[PDB]
Amino acid sequence: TRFYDQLNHHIFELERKGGILAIASLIGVEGGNATRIGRFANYLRNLLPSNDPVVMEMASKAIGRLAMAGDTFTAEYVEFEVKRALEWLEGRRHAAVLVLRELAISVPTFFFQQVQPFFDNIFVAVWDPKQAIREGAVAALRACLILTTQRWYRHTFEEAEKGFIHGALLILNELVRISSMEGERLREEMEEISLIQMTILNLLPRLAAFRPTQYLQDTMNHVLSCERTAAFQALGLLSVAVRSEFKVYLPRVLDIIRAALPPKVDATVFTCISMLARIQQDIKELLEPMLAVGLSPALTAVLYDLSRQI
């Protein structure tokens, strides 16, 4: 069985990205805990503080596969790495967020009790003047927030709204996603047709479930500013989410949707037009420029899904 052991040595002794991501099929799959837990787990313990990105690409999945093992050393690994990454979540470590997500998710038994240290360390990292961590770190909250509903918001949501634009915005998004997990489903149901700007564009389906509307009003005002090339799917997503006064906003951005076809945003307005139905008269009016685009693959796919929709 030297194949596994040699490739395991060449994980951290690592074209190279392709090879190591091929080796990733062996870690966590074969179940060779004699080397996976004996050596590779210790290697991640010892090297993830300074692991090169070329191997951290493998680590971005191997960390989760190791965390879900459930052994004693695995529990020690999850605790140590979560606490370390939270402390070091800092203007160069743009993998620790993935580390936290991989470690925490699908082990709620450690991280519905441990939501407090996530907040405390994240909102020490988040205040970096670089602002790259200000965006990355808050999104790492989901690793424990999503689990809190699986096994707070309430009080730590009051910390979110005002206690922490950037920080409060990001944490509000990461909390209103869990206030209605169904939005995730809706995203897929709708997707099959600066981080703050995407956060504004992600809030509205999730804000509609929380206080159905001033939050949606401010978010929409920012959506206009996300010139007018934002991913306006956020409004279309409200046609399947809680329809919390979304028709207040249609008179504005429909003119953005109407006035972006034929090309001349295009690939996005293709989906935004279809998301409105899940409003058929406006889509009928909109179909004319869509057919005027010409037989691109995106047009064909969205027209097929439109035919099934309308």
Side-chain angles (χ1 to χ4, degrees), residues 248-279:
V248 173
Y249 195 52
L250 285 171
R252 294 179 189 175
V253 301
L254 286 174
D255 283 348
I256 298 166
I257 293 166
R258 289 164 186 160
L261 299 171
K264 290 174 175 174
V265 176
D266 294 331
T268 302
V269 297
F270 290 166
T271 61
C272 293
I273 292 165
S274 294
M275 286 181 188
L276 294 170
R278 293 179 176 183
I279 298 167

PDB file of all heavy atoms in Angstrom, residues 248-279:
ATOM      1  N   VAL A 248     -42.968  47.291  -4.593  1.00  0.00           N
ATOM      2  CA  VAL A 248     -42.571  48.687  -4.446  1.00  0.00           C
ATOM      3  C   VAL A 248     -41.348  48.988  -5.304  1.00  0.00           C
ATOM      4  O   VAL A 248     -41.189  50.113  -5.792  1.00  0.00           O
ATOM      5  CB  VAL A 248     -42.301  49.011  -2.963  1.00  0.00           C
ATOM      6  CG1 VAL A 248     -41.725  50.418  -2.813  1.00  0.00           C
ATOM      7  CG2 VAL A 248     -43.572  48.847  -2.134  1.00  0.00           C
ATOM      8  N   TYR A 249     -40.468  48.001  -5.498  1.00  0.00           N
ATOM      9  CA  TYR A 249     -39.179  48.218  -6.144  1.00  0.00           C
ATOM     10  C   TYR A 249     -39.186  47.873  -7.629  1.00  0.00           C
ATOM     11  O   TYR A 249     -38.272  48.291  -8.349  1.00  0.00           O
ATOM     12  CB  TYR A 249     -38.111  47.387  -5.423  1.00  0.00           C
ATOM     13  CG  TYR A 249     -36.665  47.739  -5.728  1.00  0.00           C
ATOM     14  CD1 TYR A 249     -36.198  49.046  -5.625  1.00  0.00           C
ATOM     15  CD2 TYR A 249     -35.757  46.753  -6.086  1.00  0.00           C
ATOM     16  CE1 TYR A 249     -34.877  49.358  -5.892  1.00  0.00           C
ATOM     17  CE2 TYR A 249     -34.437  47.056  -6.355  1.00  0.00           C
ATOM     18  CZ  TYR A 249     -34.001  48.358  -6.256  1.00  0.00           C
ATOM     19  OH  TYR A 249     -32.684  48.655  -6.522  1.00  0.00           O
ATOM     20  N   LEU A 250     -40.180  47.118  -8.095  1.00  0.00           N
ATOM     21  CA  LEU A 250     -40.292  46.808  -9.519  1.00  0.00           C
ATOM     22  C   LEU A 250     -40.306  48.027 -10.438  1.00  0.00           C
ATOM     23  O   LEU A 250     -39.661  47.962 -11.499  1.00  0.00           O
ATOM     24  CB  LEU A 250     -41.549  45.957  -9.767  1.00  0.00           C
ATOM     25  CG  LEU A 250     -41.523  44.482  -9.355  1.00  0.00           C
ATOM     26  CD1 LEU A 250     -42.912  43.881  -9.478  1.00  0.00           C
ATOM     27  CD2 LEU A 250     -40.550  43.684 -10.216  1.00  0.00           C
ATOM     28  N   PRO A 251     -40.999  49.133 -10.135  1.00  0.00           N
ATOM     29  CA  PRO A 251     -41.016  50.259 -11.087  1.00  0.00           C
ATOM     30  C   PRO A 251     -39.646  50.840 -11.397  1.00  0.00           C
ATOM     31  O   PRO A 251     -39.486  51.462 -12.455  1.00  0.00           O
ATOM     32  CB  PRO A 251     -41.914  51.292 -10.392  1.00  0.00           C
ATOM     33  CG  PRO A 251     -42.786  50.492  -9.507  1.00  0.00           C
ATOM     34  CD  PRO A 251     -41.925  49.376  -9.012  1.00  0.00           C
ATOM     35  N   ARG A 252     -38.656  50.668 -10.520  1.00  0.00           N
ATOM     36  CA  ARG A 252     -37.316  51.172 -10.796  1.00  0.00           C
ATOM     37  C   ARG A 252     -36.505  50.222 -11.675  1.00  0.00           C
ATOM     38  O   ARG A 252     -36.283  50.495 -12.861  1.00  0.00           O
ATOM     39  CB  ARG A 252     -36.567  51.385  -9.477  1.00  0.00           C
ATOM     40  CG  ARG A 252     -37.121  52.470  -8.572  1.00  0.00           C
ATOM     41  CD  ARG A 252     -36.294  52.538  -7.296  1.00  0.00           C
ATOM     42  NE  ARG A 252     -36.875  53.400  -6.273  1.00  0.00           N
ATOM     43  CZ  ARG A 252     -36.394  53.540  -5.043  1.00  0.00           C
ATOM     44  NH1 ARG A 252     -35.339  52.858  -4.624  1.00  0.00           N
ATOM     45  NH2 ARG A 252     -36.993  54.382  -4.206  1.00  0.00           N
ATOM     46  N   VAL A 253     -36.136  49.059 -11.133  1.00  0.00           N
ATOM     47  CA  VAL A 253     -35.119  48.220 -11.759  1.00  0.00           C
ATOM     48  C   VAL A 253     -35.655  47.437 -12.944  1.00  0.00           C
ATOM     49  O   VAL A 253     -34.854  46.889 -13.719  1.00  0.00           O
ATOM     50  CB  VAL A 253     -34.473  47.247 -10.747  1.00  0.00           C
ATOM     51  CG1 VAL A 253     -33.836  48.018  -9.600  1.00  0.00           C
ATOM     52  CG2 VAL A 253     -35.476  46.222 -10.236  1.00  0.00           C
ATOM     53  N   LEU A 254     -36.976  47.356 -13.114  1.00  0.00           N
ATOM     54  CA  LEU A 254     -37.496  46.843 -14.372  1.00  0.00           C
ATOM     55  C   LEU A 254     -36.992  47.678 -15.538  1.00  0.00           C
ATOM     56  O   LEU A 254     -36.636  47.125 -16.585  1.00  0.00           O
ATOM     57  CB  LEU A 254     -39.026  46.807 -14.348  1.00  0.00           C
ATOM     58  CG  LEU A 254     -39.686  45.711 -13.502  1.00  0.00           C
ATOM     59  CD1 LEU A 254     -41.190  45.916 -13.465  1.00  0.00           C
ATOM     60  CD2 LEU A 254     -39.364  44.318 -14.032  1.00  0.00           C
ATOM     61  N   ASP A 255     -36.904  49.003 -15.365  1.00  0.00           N
ATOM     62  CA  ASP A 255     -36.310  49.824 -16.413  1.00  0.00           C
ATOM     63  C   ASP A 255     -34.846  49.476 -16.640  1.00  0.00           C
ATOM     64  O   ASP A 255     -34.352  49.634 -17.761  1.00  0.00           O
ATOM     65  CB  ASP A 255     -36.445  51.312 -16.074  1.00  0.00           C
ATOM     66  CG  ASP A 255     -37.845  51.854 -16.325  1.00  0.00           C
ATOM     67  OD1 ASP A 255     -38.663  51.162 -16.969  1.00  0.00           O
ATOM     68  OD2 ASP A 255     -38.130  52.982 -15.872  1.00  0.00           O
ATOM     69  N   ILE A 256     -34.144  49.009 -15.607  1.00  0.00           N
ATOM     70  CA  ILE A 256     -32.797  48.488 -15.811  1.00  0.00           C
ATOM     71  C   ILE A 256     -32.856  47.160 -16.555  1.00  0.00           C
ATOM     72  O   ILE A 256     -32.026  46.886 -17.429  1.00  0.00           O
ATOM     73  CB  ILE A 256     -32.056  48.350 -14.466  1.00  0.00           C
ATOM     74  CG1 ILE A 256     -31.891  49.718 -13.786  1.00  0.00           C
ATOM     75  CG2 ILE A 256     -30.698  47.680 -14.686  1.00  0.00           C
ATOM     76  CD1 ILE A 256     -31.480  49.639 -12.326  1.00  0.00           C
ATOM     77  N   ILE A 257     -33.836  46.317 -16.221  1.00  0.00           N
ATOM     78  CA  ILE A 257     -33.960  45.021 -16.882  1.00  0.00           C
ATOM     79  C   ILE A 257     -34.427  45.207 -18.319  1.00  0.00           C
ATOM     80  O   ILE A 257     -33.941  44.539 -19.240  1.00  0.00           O
ATOM     81  CB  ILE A 257     -34.913  44.107 -16.086  1.00  0.00           C
ATOM     82  CG1 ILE A 257     -34.297  43.749 -14.725  1.00  0.00           C
ATOM     83  CG2 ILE A 257     -35.231  42.842 -16.892  1.00  0.00           C
ATOM     84  CD1 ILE A 257     -35.275  43.140 -13.732  1.00  0.00           C
ATOM     85  N   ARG A 258     -35.380  46.115 -18.530  1.00  0.00           N
ATOM     86  CA  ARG A 258     -35.920  46.350 -19.865  1.00  0.00           C
ATOM     87  C   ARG A 258     -34.862  46.924 -20.799  1.00  0.00           C
ATOM     88  O   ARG A 258     -34.807  46.573 -21.983  1.00  0.00           O
ATOM     89  CB  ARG A 258     -37.120  47.293 -19.771  1.00  0.00           C
ATOM     90  CG  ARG A 258     -38.351  46.665 -19.142  1.00  0.00           C
ATOM     91  CD  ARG A 258     -39.367  47.711 -18.725  1.00  0.00           C
ATOM     92  NE  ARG A 258     -40.484  47.118 -17.997  1.00  0.00           N
ATOM     93  CZ  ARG A 258     -41.314  47.782 -17.202  1.00  0.00           C
ATOM     94  NH1 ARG A 258     -41.189  49.084 -16.992  1.00  0.00           N
ATOM     95  NH2 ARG A 258     -42.299  47.121 -16.599  1.00  0.00           N
ATOM     96  N   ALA A 259     -34.008  47.801 -20.279  1.00  0.00           N
ATOM     97  CA  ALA A 259     -33.086  48.585 -21.100  1.00  0.00           C
ATOM     98  C   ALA A 259     -31.685  47.979 -21.131  1.00  0.00           C
ATOM     99  O   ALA A 259     -30.688  48.700 -21.110  1.00  0.00           O
ATOM    100  CB  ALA A 259     -33.048  50.020 -20.589  1.00  0.00           C
ATOM    101  N   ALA A 260     -31.599  46.646 -21.174  1.00  0.00           N
ATOM    102  CA  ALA A 260     -30.311  45.961 -21.234  1.00  0.00           C
ATOM    103  C   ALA A 260     -30.298  44.820 -22.245  1.00  0.00           C
ATOM    104  O   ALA A 260     -29.419  43.955 -22.180  1.00  0.00           O
ATOM    105  CB  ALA A 260     -29.940  45.424 -19.850  1.00  0.00           C
ATOM    106  N   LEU A 261     -31.243  44.805 -23.183  1.00  0.00           N
ATOM    107  CA  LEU A 261     -31.339  43.765 -24.195  1.00  0.00           C
ATOM    108  C   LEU A 261     -31.978  44.330 -25.456  1.00  0.00           C
ATOM    109  O   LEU A 261     -32.895  45.153 -25.362  1.00  0.00           O
ATOM    110  CB  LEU A 261     -32.180  42.577 -23.700  1.00  0.00           C
ATOM    111  CG  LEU A 261     -31.717  41.798 -22.468  1.00  0.00           C
ATOM    112  CD1 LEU A 261     -32.805  40.831 -22.039  1.00  0.00           C
ATOM    113  CD2 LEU A 261     -30.436  41.044 -22.775  1.00  0.00           C
ATOM    114  N   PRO A 262     -31.528  43.913 -26.661  1.00  0.00           N
ATOM    115  CA  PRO A 262     -30.420  42.998 -27.013  1.00  0.00           C
ATOM    116  C   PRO A 262     -29.060  43.644 -26.758  1.00  0.00           C
ATOM    117  O   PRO A 262     -29.017  44.842 -26.493  1.00  0.00           O
ATOM    118  CB  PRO A 262     -30.670  42.712 -28.502  1.00  0.00           C
ATOM    119  CG  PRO A 262     -31.388  43.915 -29.004  1.00  0.00           C
ATOM    120  CD  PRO A 262     -32.258  44.357 -27.863  1.00  0.00           C
ATOM    121  N   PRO A 263     -27.949  42.903 -26.816  1.00  0.00           N
ATOM    122  CA  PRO A 263     -26.666  43.479 -26.394  1.00  0.00           C
ATOM    123  C   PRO A 263     -26.245  44.636 -27.298  1.00  0.00           C
ATOM    124  O   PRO A 263     -26.586  44.650 -28.482  1.00  0.00           O
ATOM    125  CB  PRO A 263     -25.691  42.300 -26.506  1.00  0.00           C
ATOM    126  CG  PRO A 263     -26.349  41.336 -27.426  1.00  0.00           C
ATOM    127  CD  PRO A 263     -27.813  41.477 -27.163  1.00  0.00           C
ATOM    128  N   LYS A 264     -25.503  45.627 -26.766  1.00  0.00           N
ATOM    129  CA  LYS A 264     -25.115  45.876 -25.357  1.00  0.00           C
ATOM    130  C   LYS A 264     -24.396  44.727 -24.636  1.00  0.00           C
ATOM    131  O   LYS A 264     -23.523  44.072 -25.205  1.00  0.00           O
ATOM    132  CB  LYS A 264     -26.348  46.307 -24.541  1.00  0.00           C
ATOM    133  CG  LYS A 264     -26.869  47.686 -24.900  1.00  0.00           C
ATOM    134  CD  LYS A 264     -28.171  47.983 -24.175  1.00  0.00           C
ATOM    135  CE  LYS A 264     -28.641  49.406 -24.425  1.00  0.00           C
ATOM    136  NZ  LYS A 264     -29.981  49.659 -23.826  1.00  0.00           N
ATOM    137  N   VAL A 265     -24.197  42.481 -17.710  1.00  0.00           N
ATOM    138  CA  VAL A 265     -25.588  42.669 -17.322  1.00  0.00           C
ATOM    139  C   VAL A 265     -26.486  41.724 -18.115  1.00  0.00           C
ATOM    140  O   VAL A 265     -27.482  41.229 -17.590  1.00  0.00           O
ATOM    141  CB  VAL A 265     -26.029  44.140 -17.520  1.00  0.00           C
ATOM    142  CG1 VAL A 265     -27.512  44.308 -17.195  1.00  0.00           C
ATOM    143  CG2 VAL A 265     -25.178  45.074 -16.665  1.00  0.00           C
ATOM    144  N   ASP A 266     -26.110  41.475 -19.375  1.00  0.00           N
ATOM    145  CA  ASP A 266     -26.950  40.705 -20.291  1.00  0.00           C
ATOM    146  C   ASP A 266     -27.241  39.309 -19.746  1.00  0.00           C
ATOM    147  O   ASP A 266     -28.404  38.889 -19.637  1.00  0.00           O
ATOM    148  CB  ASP A 266     -26.256  40.611 -21.652  1.00  0.00           C
ATOM    149  CG  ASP A 266     -26.129  41.962 -22.339  1.00  0.00           C
ATOM    150  OD1 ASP A 266     -26.987  42.837 -22.106  1.00  0.00           O
ATOM    151  OD2 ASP A 266     -25.166  42.150 -23.112  1.00  0.00           O
ATOM    152  N   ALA A 267     -26.180  38.581 -19.383  1.00  0.00           N
ATOM    153  CA  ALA A 267     -26.338  37.229 -18.860  1.00  0.00           C
ATOM    154  C   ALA A 267     -27.153  37.219 -17.576  1.00  0.00           C
ATOM    155  O   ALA A 267     -27.853  36.239 -17.293  1.00  0.00           O
ATOM    156  CB  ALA A 267     -24.966  36.598 -18.623  1.00  0.00           C
ATOM    157  N   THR A 268     -27.080  38.292 -16.791  1.00  0.00           N
ATOM    158  CA  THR A 268     -27.837  38.372 -15.551  1.00  0.00           C
ATOM    159  C   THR A 268     -29.291  38.760 -15.787  1.00  0.00           C
ATOM    160  O   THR A 268     -30.188  38.172 -15.175  1.00  0.00           O
ATOM    161  CB  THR A 268     -27.177  39.373 -14.600  1.00  0.00           C
ATOM    162  OG1 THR A 268     -25.824  38.971 -14.348  1.00  0.00           O
ATOM    163  CG2 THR A 268     -27.931  39.432 -13.282  1.00  0.00           C
ATOM    164  N   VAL A 269     -29.555  39.732 -16.668  1.00  0.00           N
ATOM    165  CA  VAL A 269     -30.942  40.090 -16.949  1.00  0.00           C
ATOM    166  C   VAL A 269     -31.686  38.938 -17.610  1.00  0.00           C
ATOM    167  O   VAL A 269     -32.913  38.848 -17.463  1.00  0.00           O
ATOM    168  CB  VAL A 269     -31.065  41.370 -17.805  1.00  0.00           C
ATOM    169  CG1 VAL A 269     -30.484  42.566 -17.061  1.00  0.00           C
ATOM    170  CG2 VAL A 269     -30.400  41.213 -19.157  1.00  0.00           C
ATOM    171  N   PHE A 270     -30.975  38.050 -18.324  1.00  0.00           N
ATOM    172  CA  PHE A 270     -31.601  36.815 -18.799  1.00  0.00           C
ATOM    173  C   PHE A 270     -32.312  36.080 -17.669  1.00  0.00           C
ATOM    174  O   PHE A 270     -33.468  35.669 -17.817  1.00  0.00           O
ATOM    175  CB  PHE A 270     -30.558  35.877 -19.422  1.00  0.00           C
ATOM    176  CG  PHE A 270     -29.980  36.337 -20.748  1.00  0.00           C
ATOM    177  CD1 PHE A 270     -28.833  35.729 -21.235  1.00  0.00           C
ATOM    178  CD2 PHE A 270     -30.568  37.335 -21.513  1.00  0.00           C
ATOM    179  CE1 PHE A 270     -28.280  36.113 -22.438  1.00  0.00           C
ATOM    180  CE2 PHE A 270     -30.017  37.716 -22.716  1.00  0.00           C
ATOM    181  CZ  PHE A 270     -28.874  37.106 -23.178  1.00  0.00           C
ATOM    182  N   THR A 271     -31.639  35.906 -16.534  1.00  0.00           N
ATOM    183  CA  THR A 271     -32.255  35.243 -15.393  1.00  0.00           C
ATOM    184  C   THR A 271     -33.218  36.141 -14.629  1.00  0.00           C
ATOM    185  O   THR A 271     -34.234  35.646 -14.129  1.00  0.00           O
ATOM    186  CB  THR A 271     -31.181  34.725 -14.434  1.00  0.00           C
ATOM    187  OG1 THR A 271     -30.400  35.823 -13.942  1.00  0.00           O
ATOM    188  CG2 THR A 271     -30.275  33.716 -15.132  1.00  0.00           C
ATOM    189  N   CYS A 272     -32.921  37.440 -14.514  1.00  0.00           N
ATOM    190  CA  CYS A 272     -33.813  38.334 -13.776  1.00  0.00           C
ATOM    191  C   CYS A 272     -35.192  38.394 -14.417  1.00  0.00           C
ATOM    192  O   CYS A 272     -36.206  38.478 -13.714  1.00  0.00           O
ATOM    193  CB  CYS A 272     -33.227  39.744 -13.678  1.00  0.00           C
ATOM    194  SG  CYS A 272     -31.728  39.913 -12.690  1.00  0.00           S
ATOM    195  N   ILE A 273     -35.252  38.366 -15.750  1.00  0.00           N
ATOM    196  CA  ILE A 273     -36.543  38.405 -16.428  1.00  0.00           C
ATOM    197  C   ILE A 273     -37.368  37.176 -16.061  1.00  0.00           C
ATOM    198  O   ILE A 273     -38.566  37.275 -15.773  1.00  0.00           O
ATOM    199  CB  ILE A 273     -36.344  38.526 -17.952  1.00  0.00           C
ATOM    200  CG1 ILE A 273     -35.749  39.899 -18.302  1.00  0.00           C
ATOM    201  CG2 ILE A 273     -37.669  38.296 -18.685  1.00  0.00           C
ATOM    202  CD1 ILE A 273     -35.177  40.002 -19.705  1.00  0.00           C
ATOM    203  N   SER A 274     -36.734  36.003 -16.041  1.00  0.00           N
ATOM    204  CA  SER A 274     -37.469  34.772 -15.767  1.00  0.00           C
ATOM    205  C   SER A 274     -37.840  34.652 -14.292  1.00  0.00           C
ATOM    206  O   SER A 274     -38.868  34.054 -13.952  1.00  0.00           O
ATOM    207  CB  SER A 274     -36.641  33.570 -16.214  1.00  0.00           C
ATOM    208  OG  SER A 274     -36.483  33.559 -17.622  1.00  0.00           O
ATOM    209  N   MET A 275     -37.016  35.209 -13.400  1.00  0.00           N
ATOM    210  CA  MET A 275     -37.311  35.138 -11.971  1.00  0.00           C
ATOM    211  C   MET A 275     -38.604  35.853 -11.594  1.00  0.00           C
ATOM    212  O   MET A 275     -39.191  35.532 -10.555  1.00  0.00           O
ATOM    213  CB  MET A 275     -36.149  35.720 -11.162  1.00  0.00           C
ATOM    214  CG  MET A 275     -34.914  34.828 -11.086  1.00  0.00           C
ATOM    215  SD  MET A 275     -33.601  35.567 -10.095  1.00  0.00           S
ATOM    216  CE  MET A 275     -32.256  34.425 -10.394  1.00  0.00           C
ATOM    217  N   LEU A 276     -39.061  36.811 -12.402  1.00  0.00           N
ATOM    218  CA  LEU A 276     -40.266  37.558 -12.056  1.00  0.00           C
ATOM    219  C   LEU A 276     -41.517  36.687 -12.059  1.00  0.00           C
ATOM    220  O   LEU A 276     -42.453  36.967 -11.302  1.00  0.00           O
ATOM    221  CB  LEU A 276     -40.449  38.729 -13.023  1.00  0.00           C
ATOM    222  CG  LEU A 276     -39.399  39.843 -12.983  1.00  0.00           C
ATOM    223  CD1 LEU A 276     -39.592  40.789 -14.160  1.00  0.00           C
ATOM    224  CD2 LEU A 276     -39.457  40.611 -11.671  1.00  0.00           C
ATOM    225  N   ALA A 277     -41.560  35.643 -12.886  1.00  0.00           N
ATOM    226  CA  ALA A 277     -42.749  34.806 -13.010  1.00  0.00           C
ATOM    227  C   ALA A 277     -43.009  33.941 -11.786  1.00  0.00           C
ATOM    228  O   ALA A 277     -44.168  33.608 -11.519  1.00  0.00           O
ATOM    229  CB  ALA A 277     -42.630  33.899 -14.237  1.00  0.00           C
ATOM    230  N   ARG A 278     -41.973  33.572 -11.044  1.00  0.00           N
ATOM    231  CA  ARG A 278     -42.100  32.590  -9.976  1.00  0.00           C
ATOM    232  C   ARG A 278     -42.623  33.219  -8.691  1.00  0.00           C
ATOM    233  O   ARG A 278     -43.807  33.105  -8.372  1.00  0.00           O
ATOM    234  CB  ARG A 278     -40.746  31.927  -9.737  1.00  0.00           C
ATOM    235  CG  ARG A 278     -40.292  31.085 -10.909  1.00  0.00           C
ATOM    236  CD  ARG A 278     -38.941  30.445 -10.675  1.00  0.00           C
ATOM    237  NE  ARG A 278     -38.563  29.571 -11.780  1.00  0.00           N
ATOM    238  CZ  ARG A 278     -37.456  28.841 -11.826  1.00  0.00           C
ATOM    239  NH1 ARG A 278     -36.564  28.870 -10.849  1.00  0.00           N
ATOM    240  NH2 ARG A 278     -37.234  28.067 -12.884  1.00  0.00           N
ATOM    241  N   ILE A 279     -45.631  37.330 -12.618  1.00  0.00           N
ATOM    242  CA  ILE A 279     -45.577  38.542 -13.425  1.00  0.00           C
ATOM    243  C   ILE A 279     -45.259  38.144 -14.862  1.00  0.00           C
ATOM    244  O   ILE A 279     -44.099  38.161 -15.274  1.00  0.00           O
ATOM    245  CB  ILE A 279     -44.536  39.545 -12.877  1.00  0.00           C
ATOM    246  CG1 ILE A 279     -44.907  39.995 -11.456  1.00  0.00           C
ATOM    247  CG2 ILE A 279     -44.425  40.745 -13.817  1.00  0.00           C
ATOM    248  CD1 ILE A 279     -43.796  40.731 -10.726  1.00  0.00           C
TER     249      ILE A 279
END
